[PDB]
């Protein structure tokens, strides 16, 4: 994996 | 000194309602009981868990005197729920026991000073405005599935409550989704922008059961407040800086991708159940007017969907957790949806192809 | 692994809910979280166990295919055909240690294990076999299935008794504290044979009971029972030991009758609950001519009080009661009105409903 | 508390 949104 | 009596069918809505903010094993055990504050010609049930406070005024037509005190909620609750239709409660303070008769029941139940209940400090209002309930409810329905639960960053385990112009617009994001609603309110709004906590939003849309009594919304320095009827809804706000949506959104999205909503939903629930169970892992292939969802598990099970989509742009493939694309799908109540995509390892905007009240952006996973 | 077939979403979706429910959250061995399926003669067969326990739905086929069988999971599989649209073309077959399921542009790939190692349970002949309505079997079993014991150590009790006694069919289900007895008349002239059916096993055969106008074929083995209503075959093993006598456990000369309405009891003794002991859960009742008086205290010395006027016909006695077994048997008994056979503060009351006697319930009292 | 049936 899960990409970070911020 | 405290005394009234009512009837049964008046004190249920009031007492379910200030119940609210109570939740389990408190800490101080005033936090367990409800304020019953009799003084002019109404009944005042007040419920608190510190943070925020729940407020009904009950009018009073049979003679009582004035006094206040602190009762247990849900045995105060289900004693009046559990006496017949209809029933007069003739309530008495007597000593350190409050006695509640109705007919041939009588019940004798412990009692904590109402000196000791928690009041809420004392504050100014800054912005003042009326609303109806549907708005309001929509406003936190399409939006408080993306708030963060227990995050160590306090500010985003809440709602942001948002007033831009013409506009009330609520906020909700947890690091991984973001939840974007706003709707016009027919008054001219100054810019403010607050975090209502958590657990204080969803007491606020308990209160609230379609479009039926206007709310009149007050926010505050450090609080917000709701009044709806009889009820009197009054949170803290979470002190801290909420990030701005309007960064979040894609820029600019190449790749636009349209589809029935319920379509898409059924896709992506049944391909969630090959999925991963932790990670929740899916593919997204968007070729020229069709995507397939591909789902893999530990056990080698494959799931694969293949749907026909207006879809105009570059075959492209990005990873999703299904379960916060299904938690966009159900809050999108509509006919078709829009998926704005930039590239494989960056957001995806998701919204109602009609309206454009609500956007959500979901960040994909490493494929 | 030949097995192919065809059916019909909704031809599949009620056996596979059933077949599904002996098998519960994690289970122990992983073949018990799959389903036997078996295509023969023109028909599949679904089957769910959990060794204990089994249940197999038989489905007619209408499309082409092939027999054969293997063992796919059961959660992942129904919540795919129930995921399709409704009037889908299921299309199931093999794939070496897999099953291929596709309906339309969906496509499923999912693990099977070996059919041979699914718990087929013992081979076993039948001794006693009748024929009853649904509706019979259901009152019989809802009437008595929350006085069985959930896991006492008394393995016995952690079930209920099926007794046949000549023309009527009978349970009784009781946990040491607490009895339900629930007899009635299924137009047969039967053989005296009681049978320990495992707690789990009645609420399965009750869940299976969609009230239907269809018979259910009862068939009790030596340490087996097998129930067939319409296209699904439900089997159990018997519960080994000496099942309590009810005759022993009623009162056998209870002279103090009181009547009541089964609902007005029934709120008394709900909001008397609320202030008593959260564990020992203990009211005691003050029986006077045409009055009946329910008191609660907990540890906070808090009280509640409730007169009620009831037909009370013999002399003054005070006995206590756990209010959650008495309310349990106010719940069962979805009547008019009640009586209540007192013996004395020390001994048993025998509750049941005053139009009908077919169910009767037996509360031991606690000394407060 | 408590008393047995039997």
Same sequence: chains 1, 4.
């Avoid at chain 2, 803290?236 to 909503?261: I, M, Q, S, T, W």
């Avoid at chain 2, 109540?333 to 192809?353: G, P």
């Amino acid at each position: 994996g899960q990409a970070x949104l911020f | 000194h405290m005394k009234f009596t009512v009837e049964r069918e008046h004190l249920l809505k009031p007492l379910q309602q200030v119940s609210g903010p109570l939740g389990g094993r408190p800490t101080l055990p005033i936090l367990g009981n409800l304020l019953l504050q009799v003084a002019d010609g109404t009944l005042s049930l007040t419920g608190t868990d510190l943070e925020m406070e729940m407020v009904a005024r009950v009018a009073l037509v049979q003679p009582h005197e004035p006094g206040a005190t602190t009762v247990p909620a849900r045995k105060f609750f289900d004693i009046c729920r559990g006496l017949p239709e209809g029933a007069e409660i003739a309530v008495q303070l007597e000593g350190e026991r409050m006695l509640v008769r109705s007919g041939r029941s009588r019940f004798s139940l412990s009692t904590l000073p109402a000196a000791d209940f928690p009041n809420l400090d004392d504050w100014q209002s800054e912005v003042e405005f009326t609303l109806p309930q549907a708005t309001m409810k929509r406003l936190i329905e399409a939006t408080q599935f993306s708030m963060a639960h227990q995050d160590v960053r306090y500010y985003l385990n809440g709602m942001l409550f948002e007033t831009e112009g013409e506009e009330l617009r609520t906020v909700a994001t947890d690091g991984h989704r973001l939840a974007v609603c706003s709707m016009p309110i027919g008054q001219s709004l100054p810019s403010h922008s607050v975090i209502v906590p958590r657990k204080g939003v969803i007491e606020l849309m308990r209160m609230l059961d379609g479009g039926d009594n206007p709310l009149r919304v007050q926010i505050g320095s450090n609080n917000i407040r709701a009044h709806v009827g009889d009820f009197i809804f009054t949170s803290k706000l979470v002190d801290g800086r909420f990030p701005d949506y309007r960064r979040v959104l894609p820029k600019n999205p190449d790749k636009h991708l349209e589809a029935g909503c319920d379509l898409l939903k059924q896709a992506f629930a049944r391909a969630a159940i090959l999925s991963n169970e932790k990670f929740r892992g899916v593919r997204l292939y968007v070729s020229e007017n069709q995507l397939k969802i591909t789902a893999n598990n530990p056990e080698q099970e494959e799931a694969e969907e293949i749907l026909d989509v207006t879809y105009s742009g570059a075959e492209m493939e990005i990873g999703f957790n299904v379960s916060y694309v299904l938690d966009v799908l159900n809050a999108l109540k509509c006919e078709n949806v829009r998926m704005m995509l930039t590239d494989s390892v960056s957001s995806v905007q998701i919204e109602d192809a009609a309206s454009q009240s609500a956007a959500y952006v979901v960040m994909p996973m490493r494929l």
